[PDB]
Amino acid sequence: ADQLTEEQIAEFKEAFSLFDKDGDGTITTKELGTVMRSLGQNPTEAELQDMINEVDADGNGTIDFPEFLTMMARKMKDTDSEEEIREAFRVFDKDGNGYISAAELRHVMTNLGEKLTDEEVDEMIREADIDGDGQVNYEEFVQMMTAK
Numbered sequence: 001a002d003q004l005t006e007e008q009i010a011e012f013k014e015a016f017s018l019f020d021k022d023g024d025g026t027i028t029t030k031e032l033g034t035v036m037r038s039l040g041q042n043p044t045e046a047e048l049q050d051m052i053n054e055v056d057a058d059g060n061g062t063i064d065f066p067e068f069l070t071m072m073a074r075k076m077k078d079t080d081s082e083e084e085i086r087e088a089f090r091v092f093d094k095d096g097n098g099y100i101s102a103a104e105l106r107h108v109m110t111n112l113g114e115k116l117t118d119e120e121v122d123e124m125i126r127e128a129d130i131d132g133d134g135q136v137n138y139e140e141f142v143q144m145m146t147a148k
């Protein structure tokens, strides 16, 4: 069905090196500490150890390369891809940001051959903006069009 590409593994390899900040090869609680404090978090060495227990299937207090890739190579996120929401995002995203804005929608309805006033477009993006609000993304379009 789908063909995996070495590109994915390279992605997990870039994040791995970004975490280890001491040339070690293994991610400890100290290195990870600076990994969460340099991004946007201020937890502690104790709570951190707890977040490491789930990323440790041996009992060593650290993570290796086969555990970091086997954990993030499975799921990590959710990006449904169907022939329906695929063409839709391809026609609503002509700038590149990869997001549908109330403005673009206005220029898309007039091109197809219809006539919607700014009031109709803004109200539309609002009914589909359940988690974005102000902007829409892939997931939103997949959960706004399909619904029992």
Ligand SMILES: NCCCCCCNS(=O)(=O)c1cccc2c(Cl)cccc12
Pocket (backbone or CB within 6 Å): 015, 019, 027, 032, 039, 051, 052, 055, 063
């Ligand atoms: N979670 C968003 C902020 C960080 C983004 C980069 C890291 N992304 S992550 O949160 O998936 C992640 C990466 C590497 C080690 C982790 C350990 Cl030891 C525990 C929990 C998550 C970990």
Ligand SMILES: NCCCCCCNS(=O)(=O)c1cccc2c(Cl)cccc12
Pocket (backbone or CB within 6 Å): 083, 084, 085, 086, 087, 088, 092, 100, 105, 124, 125, 127, 128, 136, 144, 145
């Ligand atoms: N290959 C299948 C393509 C299916 C396209 C369906 C388009 N369905 S739609 O015209 O109702 C529509 C288009 C673009 C954005 C929308 C937002 Cl943000 C909210 C509500 C409706 C939206």
Ligand SMILES: [Ca+2]
Pocket (backbone or CB within 6 Å): 020, 021, 022, 023, 024, 025, 026, 027, 028, 031
């Ligand atoms: Ca190290």
Ligand SMILES: [Ca+2]
Pocket (backbone or CB within 6 Å): 055, 056, 057, 058, 059, 060, 061, 062, 063, 064, 067
């Ligand atoms: Ca381990």
Ligand SMILES: [Ca+2]
Pocket (backbone or CB within 6 Å): 092, 093, 094, 095, 096, 097, 098, 099, 100, 101, 104
């Ligand atoms: Ca766009």
Ligand SMILES: [Ca+2]
Pocket (backbone or CB within 6 Å): 128, 129, 130, 131, 132, 133, 134, 135, 136, 137, 140
């Ligand atoms: Ca939204």
